[model samples]
Target chain A: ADGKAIFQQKGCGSCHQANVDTVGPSLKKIAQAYAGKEDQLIKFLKGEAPAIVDPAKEAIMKPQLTMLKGLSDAELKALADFILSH
Target chain B: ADGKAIFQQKGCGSCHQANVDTVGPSLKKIAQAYAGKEDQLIKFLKGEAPAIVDPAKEAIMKPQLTMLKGLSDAELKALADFILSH
Candidate 1:
């Protein structure tokens, strides 16, 4: 139920952080790129769409898509909403 | 394309074997419970419905329900089809 739970539970923070940039862009950058574009963010999460914040780093993020099969649509929306809130 | 593959890929067989029952019920039992009820099977897989095959052991299967989220409608059908084939 905790949206941020997946962020840490699935260990997404290995490359993604709330405010810091490391191997990938900060969550803030993604939030900005996806401003007013939540559906696109969900599509990207499903690996059905491309990245807009940092397309060059897309490959590193692809495998994580496999973990998303466990999340429902509402969970997807909540995750995107949480990320976009940055 | 390979519904059985996910059955193993996700390590579901750890508790749910193909023909035998150990910690959980057998695939055949589930297939019978879902005969001509594929939609209901998919619903149960999504954790949206209850277990009719072995309601007493439903707890053992609930966690695996999370794995169904990533699958598309077609894939859900495929997996259900494969399972119901028992």
Candidate 2:
């Protein structure tokens, strides 16, 4: 389950960068923040939680949250794990 | 602003009915449950919280959460208010 393609396919890149922060939290920051907290990441992705990396920049990422809801639990887990691995 | 028109334009009626629950919770049920909790309704619309009504059948409505992100805060508030008015 290479969620990298899933992540890329989801179009989270308009603002997010793999290693750097742009319109939203950088993937690296998200990975580090949720290093051992994977479920939290999934919840955040599921739109069941709030932004942790940077709330101020959440505006652009909120729509992406809705998009993530289409993902199944396993797909979401894969995406979270991929982000953590980044 | 007639939020009902906005709600219809947003396609919330495909699953949510005014008084009868279908794919999602009924608008009346939502309105009653969140009668005095307007902000909470808005949060739910913003994907900042879990589903309060019929979460077990929430799968169908999950993708809609993503769609709500495109709405401005004012529009979302209007939508929430309209749902409550039902």
Candidate 3:
């Protein structure tokens, strides 16, 4: 499945946007912070790693990880890829 | 991603359906035949095992496995789970 679809289906855009930050860091900012760190990105999505792009707001995003628990590694990878695409 | 989402995104429904046989065996038939054989189902999905549900139509499904090559084991497991859910 497409990562964008996953992001939309999971309502990630409800807090995070593409170019500008709102309730959470923007996708571009997160992508920049996670550039070349795909593994860490997946780890963060799985709630196994800490957020680097917006550590101050990690609490807000913490609860969001539960929604991603159902996604497989492949799906996580796709999500990471989509995020990194910015 | 959800396996049902993956199944739909990958267009597996183009050939396979829920209950009735079309271009391929129905999901119910495949699921029943593979009721407790998840590993074999994944193996077949990965093209490591031969067809058991309908060997005669294996050729039609053979090419379909190519679309699944990009899926990780976890994704395969989800897809298997979705299929077995009937």
Candidate 4:
């Protein structure tokens, strides 16, 4: 699965931009925060890890993760890779 | 259909509270804004209308609406009624 496609499909870009912050932090910011921590990123997407990029707004992202409940591990890895790539 | 159940299932309460504002406006505020305008509230849920309670944060809610795309009209009505019931 295409990671970028999953991100868009999940509406993550609605708040997260490439480099600029809006409703949520920028993709670049998130990527930077989770740099070298790919497994943690995947865990975050799995709702098993805390949000380090923007914990205060985690409530908003928590429900959003419900949308990813059906995703496979491969899909999550892809999505995580896409976010980290930003 | 149980409107309150739908609201909870959709995670609307994550941002919208009963009477206090958080990431989103309080349900009471939304109810007040859409009072006597049930149809408009339904339209808004359908992504056909604009945000009135808090337009500045509409982007955050806009993506959230994607979760409601699969709901039936009856469910949308129920959700609207539940919100307005605040």
Candidate 5:
């Protein structure tokens, strides 16, 4: 599926906005923060990286990271790729 | 970083275990369900797909998908790749 398709299917739009912060940080903000650090971006998804983008809300997102624990290296990279693409 | 590294740093190990279920589904179970549906798996991360792997628990996970909203296309894909690798 495409990026938008994946975005909706995974329910990412629920708490996250393209430009604003909701339950989590904003896509634009994240994009800018990890502009050249794709590997770090992937680490964030795997629940490895620090809460550099948003520390105050990191705790809230802690539970959500579980959804990613089951992913493979390739899948994690793809997810990161999709996010970076936007 | 490796899967385990990402898992620990990202706090995924907080709610998800390698073989057992916690606040979310079990990694082994998720791994079995999305054995080859890497695309669908990515969709799930993006919050677009329906709750097929774990419907009852999807509600709980709904809030979690937001963490993925900020990701680019590549990140989303990588996340899917990681989950499927399990």
Candidate 6:
């Protein structure tokens, strides 16, 4: 499946809304926050980046990062592109 | 350190309060939800249990489970005891 479809299939939309923060930050906000820093965003998704966006909320969101384990570079890029498209 | 101290040190208090839900569910709610099922809760903390508390939010919280890596059995037991205390 495509990145958008994977996002839905993996239930990313449940907590992450397009333009507004729900259970987590908004996709648009995340996109804007890391606009040209796709590498950093991808690292974060890969659990290599530190809690920068919301340190206070990091503990709650930190564990969730493990869900992204084992994604290929292409898939990660695609997901990043999908998030940035918002 | 004690479980309560670990909870505070590990930043669990930032998102999880005693009776109120901020970034995540309340301790009381989680405790009551898993009352008398310490094994299940421990497994969940160990990233072995499936998402049961909040399926919608599970994807978001799943990654964070990796943060518990390398914890000792006694530490985990203490942490569980603290959560149940609330």
Which candidate achieves the best lDDT against the true structure?
4
Question: Weakest 10 consecutive residues, lDDT, candidate 6 chain A?
Answer: A61-70
Residue range A1-86, candidate 2, lDDT tens digits: 66887777765654568887665668898899998999998888888788888887565455556566667899999989988988
Rank list by lDDT: 4, 3, 2, 6, 1, 5
Off by over 4 Å in 5: A1-6, B1-86
B1-86: candidate 1 lDDT, tens digit per residue: 67887666655564566798766678888888899999998888787798787778565456556666778877778888888999
Tens-digit lDDT track of model 3 for A50-85: 878777767656755766777899999999999999
State the local distance difference test value for candidate 6.
Answer: 0.75
lDDT of 1: 0.75
Which candidate's TM-score is highest?
A: 4
Residues A13-34 of candidate 1 have per-residue lDDT tens digits of 5557779887667899889989
RMSD of 1: 10.2
Model 6, span B1-86: residue lDDT tens: 38887676655665588999876789998898889988888899898888776777786666555556657778877888899888
Query: Rounded to one decimal, what is candidate 2's iRMSD?
Result: 9.8
TM-score of each prediction: 0.50, 0.50, 0.50, 0.64, 0.48, 0.63
lDDT tens readout by residue for model 3, B1-86:
58998887766775578999876789999999999999999999999999998898676566557667678999999999999999
* Clash totals for all candidate models: 2, 1, 0, 0, 57, 10
Lowest lDDT sum, 10 consecutive residues, model 2 chain B, at B57-66
lDDT of 2 at B12: 61
Supply DockQ values for each candidate. 0.05, 0.08, 0.02, 0.29, 0.06, 0.13
User: Whose DockQ is higher: candidate 4's or candidate 5's?
Assistant: 4
Q: Cα miss at A32, model 2 (Å)?
A: 0.6
> Any residue pairs clashing in model 1, and if so which?
A69-B69, A69-B70
Instruction: Please say which candidate is ahead in DockQ: 2 or 4.
Output: 4
- TM-score of model 6 vs. true structure: 0.63
- Winner of 1 and 5 under lDDT: 1
Instruction: List candidate 1 stretches off by more than 4 Å.
Output: A1-86
Q: Please state the Cα-based DockQ of model 2 relative to the true two-chain complex.
A: 0.08
